[PDB]
C-alpha cells in the first residue's frame, strides 16, 4: 500500500491550502483554457420552438501551478467528487434554453491532474441550444446553428478561450445521422466579444445543418402535384 | 414523487409504547401490464407491489394492519373512464436468490365503463355501417348515385379511424375494437363489391340478384355482430 | 511465478473412486475459481466444472453431474477433484486450470495421468 | 453448449511459411474465444485472447483475427519451436473446446 | 400564529425579515389535501416572508402555484357551475395540536379582469 | 452487545479511507465484476429512437481498505454510507436520460463481505438511445444496445467484466416485457475497448434483440391501402359509358389514400429515405392514380375495348407488386 | 436603494395560448453597502457563487411571474463584484417565463403592452426601494 498511501498524501497535499474563490495565476496573465468537445448525438431538431438537443463531452483543459505534483509519474484521475474542491472556469452556453449533467450512476464529470499541473476537466452535457431558424425557404432550406461558449464573469484579461487541437477540437459530428438533417459543414470560431463591461472571451461551433428533402419531397411535394 | 407544497408532505409521530406511526403523501406512476386485446371491453387488472429493497424476511415483516381496513377511501373513487370493482391485498413472501423477501401486493381490478365507449367509438362505426345498408334500396337501373353513396362510406370509416388510433396503443392483436372497425370495413367494401357485381352482369334474373342481395346483406351483417359481440361481451 | 502443481499419476481398477488434488501457489487462491478439464489422448479437452473456493459453489458439466465431486481447502490452497465409479473410458489425463478474466484460462496444472484397466 | 468446430485437421506446412488456422462456432460467442498451444507431453498455453489481443510473454508471430462466428489464428513464419498442437476455446458461454491440430514439415 | 417563544421587547415593533430565517423556525406543515401539483416560487429568490412582532404573533406567507383537482362533472356542458375547492390541512398534527380558524379579511379575491379564467 | 460490534465495525470501516481514489491505484487494476436483472424492458419510442429499460444494475469490485473482521460475514450499508466509499463511476455511453429510484429511500443496496469484496446492486430506469435505421419498417428488427463503461477511468485504471458467464450474466424477467409492438427475442453481450479523446476506456456492449410485430400495420395501414387498390381495379369493371360514376369512384379513391399516407407517418421519425412502408404506400398511390389515369384515357374515345387490356393487366400487375414485395421484405433478414 | 438594470438577452417566444411570453434577461442590480467595505489593491474583488449566498442581496420577485428559472450550466450564471466603497453589482441570468393578459379582441391586429413587473417580496415601501 505505499504507493497509493503516497499517491493519497500527494492529493491532500494538492487540495491543502487551495482557495476555490481565485482563479488560476491571480493577479496574473489570462489563464489558457483549452477546449475540445465530442459530439454524442445530435437529436429533435424542434423548427417549432427554434431550437435543438445536443449531447456532447464537454472538456475543457487548464493549466494550473498550484495542483502540480512531480512525486507520482502517471496522470492520477481523481473521483469525479472533487471537482466541487477544485476551481473551473465559470463557462456558460449563452443560447442554451436548458442544460443538465446527466445523473447515473454518479454525475458524469471527469477530473485528471496532469503531473506539470494540467487538468482536464470535462463533463456529459446534454443541452437544448437555440438557434433562430430562418425557415423562409423551409424546407430547401439551410441552418447556421450554433452553441455560442462563454465566460461569465471573467473578461479577457483574466481568462482567455482557445480551441484545443484547433479544427481537430471538435470531434464526432461525422458520424451524427440526424433524422431530417444533413450536417453539411461545421465551423470552430474563436472571438473575444466587446461588450458594455468590457472584452470576453468568446467560442462558437455552428454546424452549418441542411434540410433533407427525401421526406418533404415524399410526403409535401409528391401528393400535392398528384392532385 | 411526494408532495412538497407547502412543506414536504410527511408525517411522524411518536406513540407512547414506541409504535412510529410514519407516513408519507405519494403519487405514483406504478406499471401495470395492460392486456389490451379485449380493449375496450376488458377487465385490466393492476397492482401496486410494495417490497424492501435490502432487507430480507429475517430482518423485517410487512403486513396489513387490520385484515383489510388497511386501504381505505378506494370506494369513493370516480374513475373517468373505469370503475374499481374490486380491490384485494396479497402479503407475499417471494424467495429470490439470496433470500425469502417480504412483499405487499395491492391490486385493484378496474373495468372499462364501456357506457363511454359505445357511443364515443362503436356508435358512429355501427351507424355508419347502418348507412351502408341504405345504398341496396335505390335501384338497378340507374345506380350512378349508389356508387357515390357507397364509396362515401368508406371515406367516413377512414376518417373515424384515424382519429381514434391516435388515443390507442400499437398492439399487434386487433382488440376488440380494431377487429369490429375491421370487419365493418370488409362489409362496406363488399356492398360496393355488391354493386359492382350487379352493375356488370346486368349491362353485360337481374332483379332476383338485386333482391337477395337486399335480403343478405341485413342477416349476415347481424350474425356479424351477433358473434362479435358474444365472443368478445363474456 | 504461479504455477498449479497436481498431485501426480494414478491407477486404480474400475468401480473405484479416485481423489486429485490440484496446488496453486502466488496469487490469490480464493480470488479466482477453478476449472477442472479432462482430455483423451489426442481427443478434444472438455471441462468437468468449476469449484468458486470462496463460497464453495460448482457447476458441474451435465455429462459428468454426479460423476464428480470438487472440492476445495481454504487452509492449504489446493483444489480437489474426486471421480466416483471409474471405467475404461474415463481414462485420461486431468488437468486443473485458472480463469483469470472471462476471456481465456491463464495458467494450467502439469497433468494427472487416470488409468482404468 | 457450443461446439468448437475446428475446421483445419493438421497441416504439413514446410517451415518459414504462412500458416492458418480456422475455428468456427455454431452460435454467437462475441469476442471471447480464446487460443491455445499444446505441445506434446505438456499442457496447454495460451498464445491469443479476446479473439485478437496477444497474451503477455507470447511471440509476436502468433496473431489472432476474426469477429463472431469466424475465427482465424495465423502465423507469419512458422519456426522450429512453433509446433504443436492448435485447439480453441469460448467461454461466451460454459467453456468448450474444439478439437486440437498438429503442425508438420 | 402565535408562538411564545418568539417574544422579544425592544424599541423594534417588528421583526421584518426575509425567507431565510422560514427554515430556522417552526412553521406550519400546511398542505392542500386536492393538490395534483403544486411549487413556491424561487426566483430571484424564495418568495417567503416572515414577520415577527413583540407579542409573539408570526405572518409567515409565500407564494405558491397549486394545481388543485376540482370534481369537474360533466352532465350538462357548458352549463355547470362548480365551487371548487382549496382544502388544506395540517398533514400529520390532529385537530387537537392545530386549529384553522378564518379571519373575516381572509380570501382577498384580486382583480378578476386579469384573470385566465376564461 | 452484538449492535456494539456492528455499530464499532461500520464506524471503523471509514477511517483512513479516501475515496477520492480508486482501489490499488497505481498498483493494479480495479476490475469490476458487473451483471444485470432487466426487470421490464421498457416502451421502445421509435420516433425519439430509444427504448426505457428497467434494470437491476449490480456490480462488485475488490476493494482491499474495507476489510473487516466480525461475527457477521456481510455488512449492510445504507445509502448514506455508500456515499463515502468509492463507487465506480459507471455510466451509459448511449443514454439520453436515466432515473435513479429513491422512493421510498434511495433504491441502492451495498454490501460488503470480510475479504473486502463489495456488491452495489441499485435500481435505475434508463432511456438509453437505439439508432433506428429503419429502412425495412415495419418488417424490421434492430438490436437495440445498452453500451455502459467507465466516464474517467481509462482501461488502464478500470475493467469491466461480467460476474458469471457472459450468457448468464444478463437475466431479463419472465414478465419483463413490456413491448406494444416489439418482441424481445434475446439478449447479446461483448465486451470492447473504445478509442476516445482522453484515452482507451472499456464498454461493456449489450444488444437487446428485438423485432417489430406488424400485424398491427397489417389491419391498420396495409389492409386498407389493398382494399382501396382492389376498389380502383373494380371501378374498371364498372362501365365505360357511365361517366359520372367512374369519376366519382375514382377521384374518392384518391382522396382516401391521403388520409392512409398522413397516418403512417406520424408514428415514425422523418427519416428522409422511404422506410418500406412509405414505399409501399406511394406504389399503392401510384397505382390508384393510375387507375384515374387510365379511366380518363377510356373517358376520352367515349364495346370496352380499351378497357379490356387494363381490367386484364391491373390486377396482374398489382399482384406481381404484392408478391414481389412480400418476398422480397419478409425475406430479408 | 437597489439600483436595477435589465439587458434582455433575448424575447423567447410570446405564448399565445398560455397568453404568456418568455424572455432572457441579465438582470443587473447594484445596491450600496456599508459592511462590505475593503480598501485593497484591486478596486474590484470578483467572488464565487458560493460568497453570493453568504451575503444579503435583494429577494426581488417577479410580480408576474410563472415558471422562472435560472440558469446554471455549467456552474450558477451569476456574479457578484463587491467594489472598494461597498457598490455591489449582483448580475445573473434569467429565463423568467412572465404572464402577459392578452385581450384578443382586436385580433390578429391585436397589439399587447406585456409587463415585467418586478419588486422585493419581504420589504416593504420603508426598506427597500427600487
Ligand atoms: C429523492 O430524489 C429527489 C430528487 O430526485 C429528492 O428531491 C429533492 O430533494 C432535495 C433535498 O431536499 C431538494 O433540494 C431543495 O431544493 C430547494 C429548492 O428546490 C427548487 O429547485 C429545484 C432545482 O434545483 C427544483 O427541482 C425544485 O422543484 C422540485 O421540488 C419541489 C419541492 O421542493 C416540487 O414541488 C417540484 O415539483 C419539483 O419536484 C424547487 O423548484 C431548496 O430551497 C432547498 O434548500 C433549502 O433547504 C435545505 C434543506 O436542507 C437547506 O439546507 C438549504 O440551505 C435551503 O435552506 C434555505 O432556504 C430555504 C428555502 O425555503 C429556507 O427555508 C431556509 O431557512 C434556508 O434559508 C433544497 O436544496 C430538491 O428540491 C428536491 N427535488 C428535486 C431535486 O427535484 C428527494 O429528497 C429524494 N428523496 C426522497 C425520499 O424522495
Ligand atoms: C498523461 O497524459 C499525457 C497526455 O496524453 C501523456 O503525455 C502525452 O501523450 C500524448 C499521446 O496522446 C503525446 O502525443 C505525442 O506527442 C509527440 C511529441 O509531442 C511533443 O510536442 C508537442 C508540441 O507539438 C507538445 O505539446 C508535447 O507535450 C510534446 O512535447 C508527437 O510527436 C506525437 O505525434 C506523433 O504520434 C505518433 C507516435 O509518435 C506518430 O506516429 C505520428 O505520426 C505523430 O508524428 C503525439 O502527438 C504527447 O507527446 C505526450 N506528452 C505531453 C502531452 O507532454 C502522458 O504520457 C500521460 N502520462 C502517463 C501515461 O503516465
Ligand atoms: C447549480 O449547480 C451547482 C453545481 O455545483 C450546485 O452547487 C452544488 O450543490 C450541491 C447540492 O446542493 C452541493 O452539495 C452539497 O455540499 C455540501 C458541502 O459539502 C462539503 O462539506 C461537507 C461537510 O459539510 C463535506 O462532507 C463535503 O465533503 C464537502 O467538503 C454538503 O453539506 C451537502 O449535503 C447536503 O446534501 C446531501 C445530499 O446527499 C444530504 O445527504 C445532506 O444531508 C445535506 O443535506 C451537499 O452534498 C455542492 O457542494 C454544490 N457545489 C459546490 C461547489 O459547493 C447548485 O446547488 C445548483 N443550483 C441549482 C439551483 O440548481
Ligand atoms: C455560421 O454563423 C457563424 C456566426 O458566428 C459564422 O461565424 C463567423 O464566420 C465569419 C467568416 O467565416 C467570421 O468572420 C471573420 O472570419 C475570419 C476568418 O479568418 C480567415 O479569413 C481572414 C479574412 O477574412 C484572414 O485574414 C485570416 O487569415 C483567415 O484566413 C477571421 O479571421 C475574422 O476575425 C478577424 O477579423 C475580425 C473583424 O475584422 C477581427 O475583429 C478579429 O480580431 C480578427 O482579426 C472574422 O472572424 C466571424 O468571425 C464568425 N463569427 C461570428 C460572425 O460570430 C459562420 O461562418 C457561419 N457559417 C458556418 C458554416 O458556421
Ligand atoms: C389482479 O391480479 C393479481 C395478480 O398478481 C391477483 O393477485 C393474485 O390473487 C390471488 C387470489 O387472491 C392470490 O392467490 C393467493 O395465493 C396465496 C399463496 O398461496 C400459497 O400459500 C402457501 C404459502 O403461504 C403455500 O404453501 C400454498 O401451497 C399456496 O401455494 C394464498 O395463501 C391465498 O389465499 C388462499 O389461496 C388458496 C385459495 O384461493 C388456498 O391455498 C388457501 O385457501 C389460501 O388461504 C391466495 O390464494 C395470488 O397470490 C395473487 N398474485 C398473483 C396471482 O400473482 C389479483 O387477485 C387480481 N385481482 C383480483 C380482484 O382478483
Ligand atoms: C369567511 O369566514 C369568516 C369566519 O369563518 C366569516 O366571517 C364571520 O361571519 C360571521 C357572520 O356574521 C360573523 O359572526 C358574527 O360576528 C360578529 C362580529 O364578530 C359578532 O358580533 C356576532 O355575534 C357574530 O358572531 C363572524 O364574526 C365572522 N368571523 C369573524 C372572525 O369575525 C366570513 O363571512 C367568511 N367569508 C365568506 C362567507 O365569504
Ligand atoms: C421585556 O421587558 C419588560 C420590562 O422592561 C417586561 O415587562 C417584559 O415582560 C419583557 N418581555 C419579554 C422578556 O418577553
Known amino acids: 500500500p505505499s504507493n497509493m498511501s503516497l499517491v493519497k498524501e500527494t492529493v491532500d497535499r494538492l487540495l491543502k491550502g487551495y482557495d476555490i474563490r481565485l482563479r488560476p495565476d491571480f493577479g496574473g496573465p489570462p489563464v489558457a483554457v483549452g477546449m475540445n468537445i465530442d459530439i454524442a448525438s445530435i437529436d429533435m431538431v424542434s423548427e417549432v420552438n427554434m431550437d435543438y438537443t445536443l449531447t456532447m463531452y464537454f472538456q475543457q483543459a487548464w493549466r494550473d501551478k498550484r495542483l502540480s505534483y512531480n512525486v507520482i509519474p502517471l496522470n492520477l484521475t481523481l473521483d469525479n467528487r472533487v471537482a466541487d474542491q477544485l476551481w473551473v472556469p465559470d463557462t456558460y452556453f449563452l443560447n442554451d434554453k436548458k442544460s443538465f449533467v446527466h445523473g447515473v450512476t454518479v454525475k458524469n464529470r471527469m477530473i485528471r491532474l496532469h503531473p506539470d499541473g494540467t487538468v482536464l476537466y470535462g463533463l456529459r452535457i446534454t443541452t437544448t441550444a437555440a438557434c433562430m431558424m430562418d425557415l423562409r425557404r423551409y424546407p430547401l432550406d439551410e441552418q447556421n446553428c450554433t452553441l455560442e461558449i462563454e465566460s461569465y464573469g471573467y473578461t479577457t484579461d483574466d481568462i482567455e478561450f482557445y480551441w484545443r487541437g484547433d479544427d481537430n477540437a471538435v470531434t464526432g459530428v461525422t458520424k451524427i445521422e440526424l433524422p431530417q438533417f444533413s450536417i453539411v459543414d461545421y465551423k470552430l470560431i474563436t472571438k473575444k466579444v466587446v461588450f458594455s463591461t468590457g472584452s470576453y472571451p468568446r467560442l462558437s461551433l455552428s454546424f452549418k445543418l441542411k434540410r433533407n428533402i427525401g421526406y418533404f419531397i415524399l410526403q409535401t411535394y409528391m401528393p400535392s402535384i398528384l392532385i | 414523487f411526494v408532495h412538497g407544497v407547502t412543506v414536504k408532505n410527511r408525517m411522524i409521530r411518536l406513540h407512547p409504547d414506541g409504535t412510529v406511526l410514519y407516513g408519507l403523501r405519494i403519487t405514483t406512476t406504478a406499471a401495470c401490464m395492460m392486456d389490451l386485446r379485449r380493449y375496450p371491453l376488458d377487465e385490466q387488472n393492476c397492482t401496486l407491489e410494495i417490497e424492501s429493497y435490502g432487507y430480507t424476511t429475517d430482518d423485517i415483516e410487512f403486513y396489513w394492519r387490520g385484515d383489510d381496513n388497511a386501504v381505505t377511501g378506494v370506494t369513493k373513487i370516480e374513475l373517468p373512464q373505469f370503475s374499481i370493482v374490486d380491490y384485494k391485498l396479497i402479503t407475499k413472501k417471494v424467495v429470490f436468490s439470496t433470500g425469502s423477501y417480504p412483499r405487499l401486493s395491492l391490486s385493484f381490478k378496474l373495468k372499462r365503463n364501456i357506457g363511454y365507449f359505445i357511443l364515443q367509438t362503436y356508435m358512429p362505426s355501427i351507424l355508419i355501417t347502418i348507412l351502408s345498408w341504405v345504398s341496396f334500396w335505390i335501384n338497378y337501373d340507374a345506380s350512378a348515385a349508389r356508387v357515390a353513396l357507397g364509396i362515401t362510406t368508406v371515406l367516413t370509416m377512414t376518417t373515424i379511424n384515424t382519429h381514434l388510433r391516435e388515443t390507442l396503443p400499437k398492439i399487434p392483436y386487433v382488440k376488440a375494437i380494431d377487429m369490429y372497425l375491421m370487419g365493418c370495413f370488409v362489409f362496406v367494401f363488399m356492398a360496393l363489391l355488391e354493386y359492382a357485381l350487379v352493375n356488370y352482369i346486368f349491362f353485360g334474373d337481374v332483379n332476383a340478384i338485386d333482391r337477395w342481395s337486399r335480403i343478405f346483406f341485413p342477416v349476415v351483417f347481424s350474425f356479424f355482430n351477433i358473434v362479435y359481440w358474444l365472443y368478445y361481451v363474456n | 511465478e504461479i504455477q498449479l502443481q497436481q498431485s501426480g499419476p494414478e491407477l486404480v481398477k474400475p468401480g473405484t473412486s479416485v481423489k486429485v488434488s490440484c496446488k496453486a501457489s502466488g496469487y490469490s487462491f480464493t480470488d479466482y475459481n477453478m476449472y477442472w478439464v479432462k482430455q483423451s489422448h489426442g481427443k478434444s479437452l472438455e471441462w468437468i466444472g468449476y469449484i468458486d473456493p470462496y463460497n464453495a459453489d460448482t457447476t458441474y458439466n451435465r455429462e459428468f453431474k454426479g460423476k464428480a465431486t470438487l472440492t476445495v481447502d481454504k487452509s492449504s490452497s489446493t483444489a480437489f477433484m474426486h471421480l466416483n465409479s471409474l471405467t475404461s473410458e474415463d481414462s485420461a489425463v486431468y488437468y486443473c486450470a485458472r480463469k483469470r478474466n472471462n476471456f481465456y484460462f491463464d495458467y494450467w496444472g502439469q497433468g494427472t495421468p487416470l488409468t482404468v484397466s | 453448449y457450443i461446439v468448437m468446430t475446428q475446421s483445419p485437421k493438421s497441416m504439413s506446412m514446410s517451415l518459414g511459411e504462412r500458416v492458418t488456422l480456422s475455428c468456427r462456432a455454431s452460435?454467437?460467442?462475441?469476442?471471447?474465444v480464446s487460443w491455445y498451444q499444446q505441445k506434446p507431453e505438456q499442457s496447454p498455453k495460451l498464445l491469443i485472447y479476446?479473439?485478437?489481443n496477444r497474451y503477455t510473454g507470447v511471440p509476436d508471430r502468433f496473431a489472432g483475427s476474426g469477429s463472431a462466428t469466424d475465427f482465424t489464428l495465423t502465423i507469419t513464419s512458422v519456426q522450429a519451436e512453433d509446433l504443436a498442437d492448435y485447439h480453441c476455446?469460448?467461454?461466451?458461454?460454459?467453456?468448450?473446446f474444439g478439437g486440437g491440430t498438429k503442425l508438420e514439415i | 400564529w402565535y408562538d411564545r417563544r418568539l417574544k422579544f421587547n425592544s424599541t423594534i415593533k417588528v421583526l421584518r425579515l426575509n425567507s431565510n430565517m422560514v427554515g430556522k423556525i417552526w412553521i406550519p406543515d400546511t398542505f392542500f389535501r386536492n393538490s395534483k401539483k403544486a411549487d413556491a416560487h424561487w426566483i430571484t429568490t424564495p418568495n417567503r416572508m416572515l414577520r415577527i412582532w413583540n407579542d409573539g404573533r408570526v405572518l409567515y406567507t409565500l407564494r405558491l402555484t397549486i394545481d388543485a383537482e376540482c370534481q369537474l362533472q360533466l352532465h350538462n356542458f357548458p352549463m355547470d357551475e362548480h365551487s371548487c375547492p382549496l382544502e388544506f390541512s395540517s398533514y400529520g398534527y390532529p385537530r387537537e395540536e392545530i386549529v384553522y380558524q378564518w379571519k373575516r379579511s381572509s380570501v382577498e379575491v384580486g382583480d378578476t379582469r386579469s384573470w385566465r379564467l376564461y | 452487545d452484538n449492535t456494539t460490534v456492528f455499530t464499532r465495525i461500520l464506524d471503523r470501516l471509514l477511517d483512513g479511507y479516501d475515496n477520492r481514489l480508486r482501489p490499488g491505484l497505481g498498483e493494479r487494476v480495479t476490475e469490476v465484476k458487473t451483471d444485470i436483472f432487466v426487470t421490464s424492458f421498457g416502451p421502445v419510442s421509435d420516433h425519439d429512437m430509444e427504448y426505457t429499460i428497467d434494470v437491476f444494475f449490480r456490480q462488485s469490485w475488490k476493494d482491499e481498505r474495507l476489510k473487516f473482521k466480525g461475527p457477521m460475514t456481510v455488512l449492510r450499508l445504507n445509502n448514506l454510507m455508500a456515499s463515502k466509499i468509492w463507487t465506480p463511476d459507471t455510466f451509459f455511453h448511449n443514454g439520453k436520460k436515466s432515473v435513479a429510484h429513491n422512493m421510498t429511500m434511495p433504491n441502492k443496496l451495498l454490501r460488503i463481505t470480510e475479504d473486502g469484496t463489495l456488491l452495489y446492486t441499485m435500481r435505475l430506469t434508463v432511456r438509453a438511445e437505439c439508432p433506428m435505421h429503419l429502412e425495412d419498417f415495419p418488417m424490421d428488427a434492430h438490436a437495440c444496445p445498452l453500451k455502459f463503461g467507465s466516464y474517467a477511468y481509462t482501461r488502464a485504471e478500470v475493467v469491466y467484466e461480467w460476474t458469471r458467464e457472459p450468457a448468464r450474466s444478463v437475466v431479463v424477467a419472465e414478465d419483463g416485457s413490456r413491448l406494444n409492438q416489439y418482441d424481445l427475442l434475446g439478449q447479446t453481450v461483448d465486451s470492447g475497448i473504445v478509442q476516445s479523446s482522453t484515452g482507451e476506456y472499456v464498454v461493456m456492449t449489450t444488444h437487446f434483440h428485438l423485432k417489430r410485430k406488424i400485424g398491427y400495420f397489417v389491419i391498420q395501414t396495409y389492409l386498407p391501402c389493398i382494399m382501396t387498390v382492389i376498389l380502383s381495379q373494380v371501378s374498371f369493371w364498372l362501365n365505360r359509358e357511365s361517366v359520372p360514376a367512374r369519376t366519382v369512384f375514382g377521384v374518392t379513391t384518391v382522396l382516401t389514400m391521403t388520409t392512409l399516407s398522413i397516418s403512417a407517418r406520424n408514428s415514425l421519425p422523418k427519416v428522409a429515405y422511404a422506410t418500406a412502408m412509405d414505399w409501399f404506400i406511394a406504389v399503392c398511390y401510384a397505382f390508384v392514380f393510375s387507375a384515374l389515369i387510365e379511366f380518363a384515357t377510356v373517358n376520352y374515345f367515349t364495346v370496352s375495348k380499351i378497357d379490356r387490356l387494363s381490367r386484364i393487366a391491373f390486377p396482374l400487375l398489382f399482384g406481381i407488386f404484392n408478391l414481389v414485395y412480400w418476398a422480397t421484405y419478409l425475406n430479408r433478414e | 436603494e437597489v439600483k436595477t438594470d435589465i439587458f434582455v438577452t433575448s424575447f423567447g417566444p410570446v405564448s399565445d395560448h398560455d397568453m404568456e411570453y418568455t424572455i432572457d434577461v441579465f438582470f443587473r442590480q447594484s445596491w450600496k453597502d456599508e459592511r462590505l467595505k475593503f480598501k485593497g489593491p484591486m478596486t474590484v474583488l470578483r467572488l464565487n457563487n458560493l460568497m453570493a449566498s453568504k451575503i444579503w442581496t435583494p429577494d426581488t420577485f417577479f410580480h408576474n411571474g410563472k415558471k422562472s428559472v435560472a440558469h446554471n450550466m455549467t456552474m450558477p450564471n451569476k456574479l457578484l463584484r463587491i467594489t472598494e466603497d461597498g457598490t455591489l453589482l449582483y448580475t445573473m441570468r434569467l429565463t423568467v417565463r412572465a404572464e402577459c393578459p392578452m385581450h384578443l379582441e382586436d385580433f390578429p391586429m391585436d397589439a399587447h403592452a406585456c409587463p415585467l413587473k418586478f419588486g422585493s417580496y419581504a420589504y416593504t415601501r420603508a426598506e427597500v426601494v427600487y
Open positions: 479476446g479473439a485478437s
Open positions: 476455446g469460448q467461454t461466451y458461454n460454459y467453456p468448450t
Open positions: 452460435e454467437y460467442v462475441g469476442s471471447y
